[PDB]
Recover the amino acids of this structure.
């Protein structure tokens, strides 16, 4: 076929029920994740080829960057709770990987302040049990698919994108292959 199991995607031999339709995992410490966000705009190009109404989920992971890795998972929970993902994603990526000015939870917090989230509102979210359950959800979703590397995308809890099996000579061609594959899996 044109799309083959083990080629553009792999199948989970242990499918995950009740899973989000399009589930993406990343880490702010993850170098391909930086590219996926800043250079390729994967998430956005996938959305543009999915129907309207199809919900897309993106979660942070703990297994990179030790203590600061976990802080970032909690900060992403804050971002999701406040709906400010599109305001902090880029400065968090650049703070960790480009300027390397993010070295503590206080430095993460600074990114949110600079993006215009008020201190009171950030600290309250950070310490809230809504955010605690949002952290729980991120951990549970990664554990369900026994996640050991990022970036990762899962469709309907049963297919996993395999970007290693796409051409990378052209960046634009790579992104559309990736997006078209998601659409195909979506329709499967």
């Amino acid at each position: 076929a044109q799309y083959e199991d083990g080629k553009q995607y792999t199948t989970l031999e242990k499918p995950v029920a009740g899973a989000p339709q399009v589930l993406e995992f990343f880490s702010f410490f993850c170098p391909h994740c930086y590219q996926f966000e800043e250079v390729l705009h994967i998430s956005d190009n996938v959305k543009k080829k999915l129907p309207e109404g199809v919900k897309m989920t993106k979660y942070h992971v703990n297994f990179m960057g030790g203590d600061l890795g976990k802080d970032l998972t909690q900060a992403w929970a804050v971002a999701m709770a406040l709906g400010v993902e599109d305001k902090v994603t880029v400065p968090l990526f650049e703070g960790v990987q480009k300027t390397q000015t993010i070295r503590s939870a206080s430095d993460i917090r600074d990114v949110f302040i600079n993006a215009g989230i008020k201190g009171e509102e950030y600290d309250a979210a950070w310490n809230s049990f809504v955010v605690k359950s949002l952290v729980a959800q991120q951990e549970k979703a990664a554990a369900d698919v026994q996640l050991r590397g990022v970036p990762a995308m899962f469709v309907n809890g049963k297919y996993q994108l395999n970007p290693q099996g796409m051409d990378t000579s052209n960046m634009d061609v790579f992104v559309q292959q990736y997006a078209d594959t998601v659409k195909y899996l979506s329709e499967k």
Summary: The first strand starts at residue 9 and ends at 11. The chain has one domain: 1-188. Residues 66-82 form the longest helix (17 residues).
